[PDB]
Amino acid sequence: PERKNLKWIGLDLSNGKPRDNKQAGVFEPTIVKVKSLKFATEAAITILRIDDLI
Amino acid sequence: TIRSQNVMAAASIANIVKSSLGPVGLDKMLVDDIGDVTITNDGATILKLLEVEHPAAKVLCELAD
Amino acid sequence: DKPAQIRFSNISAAKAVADAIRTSLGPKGMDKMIQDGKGDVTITNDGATILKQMQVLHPAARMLVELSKAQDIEAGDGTTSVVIIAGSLLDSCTKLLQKGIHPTIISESFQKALEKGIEILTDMSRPVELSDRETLLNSATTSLNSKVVSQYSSLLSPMSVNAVMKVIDPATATSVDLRDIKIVKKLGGTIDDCELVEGLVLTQKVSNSGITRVEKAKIGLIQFCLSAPKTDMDNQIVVSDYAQMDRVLREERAYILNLVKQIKKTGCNVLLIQKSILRDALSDLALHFLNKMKIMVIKDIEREDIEFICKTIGTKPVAHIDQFTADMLGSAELAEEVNLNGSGKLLKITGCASPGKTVTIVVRGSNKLVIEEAERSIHDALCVIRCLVKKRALIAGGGAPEIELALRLTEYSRTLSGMESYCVRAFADAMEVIPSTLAENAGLNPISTVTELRNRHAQGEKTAGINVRKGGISNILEELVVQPLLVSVSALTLATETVRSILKIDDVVNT
Numbered sequence: 178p179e180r181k182n183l184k185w186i187g188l189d190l191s192n193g194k195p196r197d198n199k200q201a202g203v204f205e206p207t208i209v210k211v212k213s214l215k216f217a218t219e220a221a222i223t224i225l226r227i228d229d230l231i
Numbered sequence: 232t233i234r235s236q237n238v239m240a241a242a243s244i245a246n247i248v249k250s251s252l253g254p255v256g257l258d259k260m261l262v263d264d265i266g267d268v269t270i271t272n273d274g275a276t277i278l279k280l281l282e283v284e285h286p287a288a289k290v291l292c293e294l295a296d
Numbered sequence: 297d298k299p300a301q302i303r304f305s306n307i308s309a310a311k312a313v314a315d316a317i318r319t320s321l322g323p324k325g326m327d328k329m330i331q332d333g334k335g336d337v338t339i340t341n342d343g344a345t346i347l348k349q350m351q352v353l354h355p356a357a358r359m360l361v362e363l364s365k366a367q368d369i370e371a372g373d374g375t376t377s378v379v380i381i382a383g384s385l386l387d388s389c390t391k392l393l394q395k396g397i398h399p400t401i402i403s404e405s406f407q408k409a410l411e412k413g414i415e416i417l418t419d420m421s422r423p424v425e426l427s428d429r430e431t432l433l434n435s436a437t438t439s440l441n442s443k444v445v446s447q448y449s450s451l452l453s454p455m456s457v458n459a460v461m462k463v464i465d466p467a468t469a470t471s472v473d474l475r476d477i478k479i480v481k482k483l484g485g486t487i488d489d490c491e492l493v494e495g496l497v498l499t500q501k502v503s504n505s506g507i508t509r510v511e512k513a514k515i516g517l518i519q520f521c522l523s524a525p526k527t528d529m530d531n532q533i534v535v536s537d538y539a540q541m542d543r544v545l546r547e548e549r550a551y552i553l554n555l556v557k558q559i560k561k562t563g564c565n566v567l568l569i570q571k572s573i574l575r576d577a578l579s580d581l582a583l584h585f586l587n588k589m590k591i592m593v594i595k596d597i598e599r600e601d602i603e604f605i606c607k608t609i610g611t612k613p614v615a616h617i618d619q620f621t622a623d624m625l626g627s628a629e630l631a632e633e634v635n636l637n638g639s640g641k642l643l644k645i646t647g648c649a650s651p652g653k654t655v656t657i658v659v660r661g662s663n664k665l666v667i668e669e670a671e672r673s674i675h676d677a678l679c680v681i682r683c684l685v686k687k688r689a690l691i692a693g694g695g696a697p698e699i700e701l702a703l704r705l706t707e708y709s710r711t712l713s714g715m716e717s718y719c720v721r722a723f724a725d726a727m728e729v730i731p732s733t734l735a736e737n738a739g740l741n742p743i744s745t746v747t748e749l750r751n752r753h754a755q756g757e758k759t760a761g762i763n764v765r766k767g768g769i770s771n772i773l774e775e776l777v778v779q780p781l782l783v784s785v786s787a788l789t790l791a792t793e794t795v796r797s798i799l800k801i802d803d804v805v806n807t
Contacts, residue, residue: 223339226326229329230329230330230331230337231316231328
């Protein structure tokens with residue numbers, strides 16, 4: 178828990194190393210990505226509840 | 232093979248759009264018709280343009296749109 | 297044996313339909329995709345819709361889908377349950393045929409098992425003693441919130457409850473038909489502004505006839521022409537005889553004037569005109585004349601709505617103009633135009649004498665999909681209420697009735713004699729599929745769940761099953777899902793009659 182600043186190291190989009198994505202790096206809006214996760218899960222439910230085509 | 236037939240189609244769509252996820256991703260040649268060659272590396276455009284042929288891919292792309 | 301092979305083919309087709317429907321049973325039932333030649337698919341978990349859209353061709357499959365439709369039209373719901381219960385009845389049937397039991401003995405044994413099941417569900421129920429507002433409202437709320445539909449159930453259901461109560465209050469064994477409580481759609485408005493309306497409300501037709509309001513509006517049905525005679529042409533002469541159409545229609549106008557004057561001496565205030573396509577049109581100038589002595593008209597009413605409103609306003613059918621009697625009309629208390637409830641003009645009529653206090657539900661919204669969700673929600677509410685009134689009960693759902701029946705009916709078959717005893721035991725073993733498949737549409741493994749339910753019902757606790765709020769066996773109280781028994785006993789009766797018919801067959805012959 179002392180390393181709470183470590184919450185947000187991610188890959189650099191334009192590079193291949195993990196970077197501290199607040200002190201530097203890219204940001205993406207929380208709403209768009211939280212909705213991305215939500216719609217991804219809803220898709221994975223709607224297409225997985227399928228059983229057969231008749 | 233009644234659910235895997237859907238999972239594999241969705242996985243194929245993911246494999247197609249995967250190589251262009253980030254800003255450094257590769258270019259996709261999408262041809263919905265003969266001669267209409269298009270080269271875009273943003274997966275949203277190809278998803279709007281890729282002519283899915285399987286209803287699972289249909290619904291997944293519909294939710295993406 | 298050739299008849300045996302054909303009967304096996306029939307029961308196998310029934311198996312195919314039941315297997316197609318099984319996984320969609322219950323609120324947590326999985327989705328199915330329906331593919332047809334039109335070039336797309338649809339996603340749904342309602343087995344009734346699947347059978348409606350299914351390209352059913354086999355005779356036994358046709359009988360099973362007719363069973364689903366009959367269950368939907370007669371009982372409130374449970375088509376997905378009745379189809380699968382019939383399929384597993386056919387499963388026990390094929391097992392018993394392999395054991396060598398002749399189908400007629402199987403049929404009589406299924407009648408004995410069915411009557412025992414009706415008795416045990418009669419003993420399943422807690423007497424809800426519904427007699428007043430609060431009982432009906434509480435039963436409706438628990439039934440509605442026990443199922444999937446919950447977003448607007450507590451909002452729109454109470455008006456439907458009040459209407460279907462006020463039409464018939466007391467403890468009548470027969471309940472109100474949906475043909476007695478018809479619904480009307482307004483695309484405009486909201487959800488909360490929906491209401492129960494006595495009489496009839498319908499879209500605009502009349503203009504420039506004092507449309508503001510009429511007291512004691514005499515309403516007359518029309519199924520006869522009010523225009524010039526029509527043929528291969530609208531006239532019997534050349535359409536270019538410029539001097540002649542005038543000189544013949546100057547008396548044809550007198551003819552239609554005599555018609556509207558006859559309508560006047562009949563004593564009408566508003567008119568009820570039948571569906572148009574099977575009849576000639578109506579001359580708007582005759583409408584203009586009948587306006588000036590303050591008489592309106594309503595036209596293009598669908599036939600089913602015609603007999604609906606006519607039997608609910610004391611007006612008998614009008615096959616011709618000759619019947620001029622004043623009693624021929626209906627006597628509504630008020631006809632008036634409501635305007636501010638969204639775009640469109642609503643001709644609402646109420647207060648007419650009727651053999652029963654008929655009421656219609658004006659459903660409202662803001663989108664076509666909104667109208668559809670509202671309409672099937674109110675339809676489900678109405679059918680649930682009427683089947684509740686037919687037989688007062690709130691038995692537990694989610695696998696409880698058939699587990700407890702399988703236990704008690706297995707005991708009964710143990711006490712029974714003849715091949716009928718073994719067949720009734722097979723009846724119980726067949727019926728234990730639906731709790732098993734409800735578990736198999738929940739996280740729990742079906743076998744452990746069904747044996748746990750059987751043990752619970754064999755140790756008291758006569759109401760236990762699988763709910764919607766979770767997957768485990770928690771149906772002692774509160775979170776338990778409950779239904780009026782009539783849906784379950786109708787599932788049993790209809791499925792038993794269908795399996796009786798199916799095994800009653802040796803061969804399917806072509807005329």
